[PDB]
């Protein structure tokens, strides 16, 4: 369907970022196949790139007849752009049938000649295209039915992403591949004569912050893309270990409070064990930024009036920031979770703890810089409501 548009629009990106890391010059010498101009808000149409994997069958000239025809209509109406059309494929057999290179008298004999509703068509005749006008299309056209499988190129992209600065495989396919994807895409669509340098690429896509891949969540689906984040980052990380776990969250004034609350309940429900029949309990910590004081205060009262007990180190008015109650609250069972008001009180909370410390930071437009020592996890999202389905 139209997924082959997406399932393949990423192939040309991987082939492009593989084209950079394989380059060992480590200097500013490489150019890029540039212009897409997609505006991925909808992304269902505008199929300038595709990839087909009828490997269970063979290439037949009739599976890819229509895509090339829809490609021709784009060049037919927009010849004056100089962009390139890309087509890839991976089949069991049948690759021998595509007589390469592409010639016109072979082009219109198997691709532009088809049968629809017991009548035949000739696309070049039915649109008035000279063979000279057709020659530009076949030149701008890129066909490779002998290409690697989509899965094997994705893995080949991973093993190369590990073999640049020696990361781990079980965690890199959700961190480095993503930030390199969007970076290459934004560089491609921009026609600012921006050619990449291999040095600047790596030193600008590795900050422990997972950015939003606007293509993957369209490929897998929000219900599934969020599950891919849960099983990879947080479910792999910890299952039952009592540590000092932190949850930094960005929420702006536009965000609803009743939505934020139901997220806090999910953290306490999953990342806590205040059992009467246990001897090593744990309760989590929170933190917020990018809001007003009264909005944070009005949030606390509701959680307290709803009988969800917590502590923020201020047991009374005029109390200095006393963190030892957070340690007691971390072990107390009448305290469901802990609260951290501001940022200056956050650094002081780390210095007063002598056990394992993890950080799960989320943000929309502004992320908080965190000391490099702790196992921090920074994650970008579109809406706040997507966080509940990760924790």
Q: What share of the chain is helix, strand, coil (3-state, %, to 5)?
A: 40, 15, 45
Determine which residue in the list 195, 273, 280, 304 makes contact with a second copy, applying CB under 8 A.
Answer: 304
Stretch binding a second copy (CB under 8 A), from 38-46, 196-204, 218-226, 294-302:
294-302
- Are the C-beta atoms of 201 and 22 separated by less than 8 Å? no
Q: How far is the CB of 339 from a second copy (least distance, A)?
A: 7
Length of the chain: 391
Residue 101 within binding range of a second copy, rule CB under 8 A: no
The contacts found for 343-348 with CB under 8 angstroms, 24 or more apart, are 343/287, 343/289, 343/368, 345/313, 345/321, 346/287, 348/321, 348/323
Cβ of 247: how many Cβ atoms within 10 Å?
22
C-alpha 356 chain-centroid distance:
29
Considering the complex, state which of residue 158 and residue 309 has its C-beta at the smaller distance from a second copy: 309
Go through 44-79 and write b for each residue having 16 or more CB atoms within 10 A of its CB, e for each that does not.
Answer: eebbbbbbbbeeeeebebebbeebbbebbebbbeee
- For residues 149 and 319, which CB has a smaller minimum distance to a second copy in the complex? 319
**Nearest residue to 213 (alpha-carbon basis) of 228, 192, 191:** 228
Closer by beta carbon to a second copy, 169 or else 297: 297
36-44, 93-101, 305-313, 376-384 -> range binding a second copy (CB under 8 A): 305-313
Helix 11-21 to helix 176-189 angle (10° resolution) is 100
At 113, phi and psi to the nearest 5? -125, 110
Q: Which is nearer to a second copy, 36 or 312 (CB)?
A: 312
Residues 6+ apart with CB under 8 A from 45: 2, 5
Per DSSP, helices labelled H in the chain are 3-9, 11-21, 65-77, 104-110, 131-140, 150-165, 169-172, 176-189, 198-202, 216-220, 222-229, 235-237, 257-270, 293-305, 324-331, 344-351
Binding range to a second copy, per CB under 8 A, among 15-23, 299-307, 346-354, 364-372: 299-307
User: Nearer to a second copy by C-beta: 132 or 307?
Assistant: 307
Shortest CB 301 distance to a second copy, Å: 6
Q: In whole angstroms, how close is the CB of 290 to a second copy at the nearest point?
A: 17
Binding characters for a second copy, 347-366, by CB under 8 A (x = yes): --------------------
Positions in 315-334 near a second copy (CB under 8 A): 315-320, 322
The half-sphere exposure of 343 on its side-chain side, counting CA atoms within 13 A, is 10
Q: Are 268 and 308 in contact (CB under 8 A)?
A: yes
Among 146, 241, 297, 328, binds a second copy (CB under 8 A): 297
Instruction: Decide whether 196 or 299 has the Cβ nearer to a second copy.
Output: 299
Nearer to a second copy, 77 or 293 (CB): 293
CB of 341 to a second copy, least distance (A): 6
x-marked contacts with a second copy along 236-275 as a string, rule CB under 8 A: ----------------------------------------
Nearest to 247 by CA among 364, 347, 362: 362
Using CB under 8 A, pick the residue from 178, 283, 311, 380 that binds a second copy: 311
Nearer to a second copy, 274 or 309 (CB): 309
- Pick the piece of the chain touching a second copy (CB under 8 A) from 55-63, 148-156, 251-259, 313-321: 313-321
Q: How many residues bind a second copy (CB under 8 A)?
A: 21
Residue among 253, 293, 307, 365 that touches a second copy (CB under 8 A) = 293
1 Cβ contact partners less than 8 Å away, ≥ 6 residues apart? none
* 125/304 with CB nearer a second copy: 304
**Which of 137, 175, 217, 310 is close enough to bind a second copy by CB under 8 A?**
310
Closest to a second copy by CB, 218 vs 322, is: 322
How far is CA 127 from each of CA 85, 112, 121, rounded to the nearest angstrom?
A: 19, 11, 11
Binding site for a second copy (CB under 8 A): 293-294, 296-298, 300-301, 304, 310-312, 314-320, 322, 339, 341
């Amino acid at each position: 369907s139209a997924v082959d548009t997406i399932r393949g629009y990423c192939y040309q990106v991987d082939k492009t970022i593989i084209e950079i890391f394989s380059l060992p010059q480590m200097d500013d010498s490489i150019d890029i196949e540039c212009i897409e101009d997609v505006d991925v808000y909808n992304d269902g149409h505008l199929t300038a790139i595709q990839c087909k994997y009828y490997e269970s069958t063979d290439y037949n000239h009739s599976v890819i007849s229509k895509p090339i025809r829809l490609m021709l209509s784009h060049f037919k109406d927009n010849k004056e752009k100089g962009a390139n059309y890309y087509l890839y494929g991976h089949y069991k057999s049948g690759q021998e049938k595509l007589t390469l290179p592409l010639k016109v008298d072979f082009f219109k004999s198997n691709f532009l000649t088809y049968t629809e509703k017991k009548i035949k068509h000739e696309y070049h005749i039915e649109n008035g295209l000279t063979e000279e006008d057709l020659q530009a299309f076949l030149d701008r056209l890129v066909i490779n039915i002998n290409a690697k499988s989509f899965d094997d190129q994705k893995k080949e992209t991973i093993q190369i992403i590990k073999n640049h600065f020696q990361c781990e495989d079980y965690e890199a396919e959700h961190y480095l591949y993503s930030n390199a994807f969007r970076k290459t895409y934004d560089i491609s669509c921009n026609k600012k004569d921006r050619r990449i340098k291999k040095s600047d690429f790596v030193e600008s896509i590795n900050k422990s912050k997972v950015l939003f891949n606007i293509w993957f969540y369209q490929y897998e689906g929000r219900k599934e893309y969020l599950r891919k984040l849960k099983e990879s980052f947080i479910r792999r990380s910890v299952n039952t270990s009592p540590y000092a776990r932190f949850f930094i969250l960005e929420f702006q004034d536009k965000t609803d409070i009743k939505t934020v609350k139901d997220c806090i309940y999910k953290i306490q429900s999953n990342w806590s064990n205040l059992s009467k029949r246990t001897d090593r309990p744990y309760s989590p910590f929170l933190l917020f930024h990018g809001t007003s004081d009264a909005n944070l205060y009005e949030l606390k009262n509701q959680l307290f009036n709803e009988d969800l007990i917590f502590t923020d180190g201020y047991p009374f008015k005029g109390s200095v920031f006393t963190p030892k109650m957070l340690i007691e609250g971390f072990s107390n069972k009448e305290i469901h979770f802990q609260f951290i008001n501001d940022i200056d009180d956050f650094n002081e909370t780390l210095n007063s703890i002598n056990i394992r410390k993890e950080v799960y930071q989320f943000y929309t437009e502004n992320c908080l810089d965190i000391p490099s020592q702790l196992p921090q996890v920074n994650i970008q999202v579109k809406d706040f409501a997507d966080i509940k389905e990760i924790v």
